[PDB]
Structure 1
């Protein structure tokens, strides 16, 4: 495949005049207040991807942020609860038009309890993802070729998943539930950033 590697930001949005963009991030860990954003991966849904290295202390990425702020472009995530949190904490913009394949899976793949990306890709596309050591030093000044190819592999197939999940949501008549969940998802991410990350806010206890 084609993986374009950039420093700081996209040079322009010439490749992203599209209706939906696949988005994924890579960080130093699960705690946005401690673990900085290190890499952002994007795809137009074609056979190529862009991998943008974010520098320590970087506060702005205008072209990327333009994509994240544009309400006419749906941002596709897998477990967007996390990516939205870390992106908003880093760049100050919370996306508000999103689609999450994990929520969609929990709303459609009711016949399994395994909702990870590897399992979804295996069932829906017969594509074998080798998630061998996503645990690596993403803060390295120069990423290895294996790192870049693994990082890119996480976004090349989210569009196809979105198409299938939209078919499943239509088939089982769950469109309005999914729409409301996606509408609330950015506020779930905000609640995480504000300090309620360990609390199911709707639970009795």
Structure 2
């Protein structure tokens, strides 16, 4: 593998002249108002990944923000509801072209109730994701090798999942449903930032 570790921002976009980029984040917790962004992960799908450490109080990441803002590049997330919220809270730019593998899983893997990334990777690809480092100090000044390898491991497979999920969505005739869900997902994240994170806004009660 190749994992390029950076401080603050990508040096340039030379490796990202592509149609879709897999994106993930790591934070200090589940509450964007309390838990700061610590890591941003990117991959072009070529089997390598970039891991960008975000400093405390960092307000800008121009190359990263260009990627997040570019409407011609689909950002692939797993449970993007969270990542979109924390990214918008941190850098002030809300992505609007997204694909979420968790929503896709809920729309296609109807034969199971386990939609976590580990189960998806195990079932669809026979790839073992190790989650031991998921609960670790992502704010450490120097990330461990195990942390760096885990962070890259979270983004290395999202392209293959998107390909398979697009096949399943086409087969079961949910393409327009999925497209509408992804179109609404950024606004669901915005509602999370504004204070309705514990509320299903569409529920009767």
TM over 0.5: yes
Q: What are the ranges of 5 or more consecutive residues in structure 1 without an aligned counterpart?
A: none
Asked whether the 8 Å contact 2:76–2:99 carries over to 1, the reply is yes
Report the equivalent of 2:25.
25
Asked whether the 8 Å contact 2:133–2:150 carries over to 1, the reply is no
CA distance in 2, matches of 1:59, 1:180: 31
Asked whether the 8 Å contact 2:22–2:75 carries over to 1, the reply is yes
* Offset of residue 129 of structure 1: 1.0
Q: Which runs of 4+ in 1 moved over 3 A?
A: none
How many pairs align? 205
Q: What are the ranges of 5 or more consecutive residues in structure 2 without an aligned counterpart?
A: none
SS of alignment partner, residue 196 of structure 1 = coil
Summarize deviations over 1:65-88 as a string: whole Å, max 9, x none.
000000000000000000000000
TM-score (norm. length: structure 1):
0.99
TM-score (norm. length: structure 2):
0.99
CA distance in 2, matches of 1:14, 1:7: 17
Asked whether the 8 Å contact 2:27–2:39 carries over to 1, the reply is yes
Q: Which piece of structure 1 moves more, 122-131 or 158-167?
A: 122-131
CA distance in 1, matches of 2:163, 2:42: 17
SS of alignment partner, residue 201 of structure 1 = coil
SS of alignment partner, residue 154 of structure 1 = helix
CA distance in 2, matches of 1:101, 1:32: 21
Asked whether the 8 Å contact 2:133–2:146 carries over to 1, the reply is no
CA RMSD across the alignment: 0.4
